[PDB]
């Protein structure tokens, strides 16, 4: 379509060597839209774990999203880091079935607390009919549900924004975490999810997480591939 740079027809896909190292170049179709969310969960939650100093830099490796922007992703050579990545992969695989409502990184002072001192949450929306109509409370939903899929390049922009905001939030905005804490991954199944379906690594629970009444809330950003949407949020005592 742009003949000032190419005689070939334009394709809704990302032409970048660095991007392809971590993410699918096409995200418009249902499977690759879902594959993108899986990679997004892995990348963003890796960034959060590292940037908040929840796990030391030994558990991570240096990656790039663009030539200008780098991040720390969990390393598959380290066994404990690998076990966490599998957690994240299992939760990500549940977006293919369409069963995952929210996955949150939950920080508490004592192990087992239902009330957190810091939460990084990623809430999902599933679309049908060409990825246009949302399937069906929360403040983000009304807006994000109406949000259109605007191409691969827009998704890359949204991903770059999220990682920059995370690195900026954790470094320049949030206070350091207390000397003692328990970090946890907790998720919420959708209503469509069968009772026999369980995400590997996650034991069932009658408790999610609760917040303080005066805890602050900041939005990191959103993602809108072809057939899915995600909303990233942070509640924190350290704000």
């Amino acid at each position: 379509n742009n003949y000032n740079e190419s005689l070939n027809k334009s394709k809704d896909a990302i032409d970048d060597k660095t991007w392809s190292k971590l993410f699918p170049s096409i995200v418009s179709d249902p499977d690759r839209s879902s594959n993108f969310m899986i990679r997004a969960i892995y990348v963003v939650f890796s960034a959060v774990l590292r940037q908040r100093n929840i796990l030391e830099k030994e558990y991570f490796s240096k990656n790039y999203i663009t030539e200008n922007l780098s991040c720390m992703t969990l390393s598959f050579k380290n066994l404990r880091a690998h076990q966490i990545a599998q957690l994240l992969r299992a939760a990500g695989d549940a977006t293919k079935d369409g069963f995952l409502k929210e996955i949150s990184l939950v920080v508490t002072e004592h192990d087992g607390d239902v009330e957190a001192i810091e939460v990084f949450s990623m809430k999902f929306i599933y679309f049908e009919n060409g990825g246009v109509v949302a399937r069906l409370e929360d403040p983000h939903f009304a807006e994000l549900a109406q949000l259109r899929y605007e191409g691969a390049e827009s998704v890359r922009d949204q991903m770059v924004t999220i990682v920059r905001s995370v690195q900026f939030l954790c470094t320049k905005v949030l206070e350091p975490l207390p000397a003692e804490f328990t970090a946890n991954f907790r998720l919420k199944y959708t209503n469509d999810a069968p009772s026999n379906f369980r995400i590997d690594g996650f034991d069932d629970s009658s408790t999610f997480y609760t917040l303080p009444d005066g805890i602050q809330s900041v939005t990191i950003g959103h993602l809108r591939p072809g057939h899915h949407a995600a909303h990233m949020q942070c509640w924190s005592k350290s704000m």
Binding site: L87, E180, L187, A193, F202, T207
Partner: peptide
């Protein structure tokens, strides 16, 4: 209604 909690967790002492 239904929730899931990771079996492995991260502690700092």
């Amino acid at each position: 209604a239904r929730y899931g909690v990771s079996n492995t967790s991260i502690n700092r002492k």
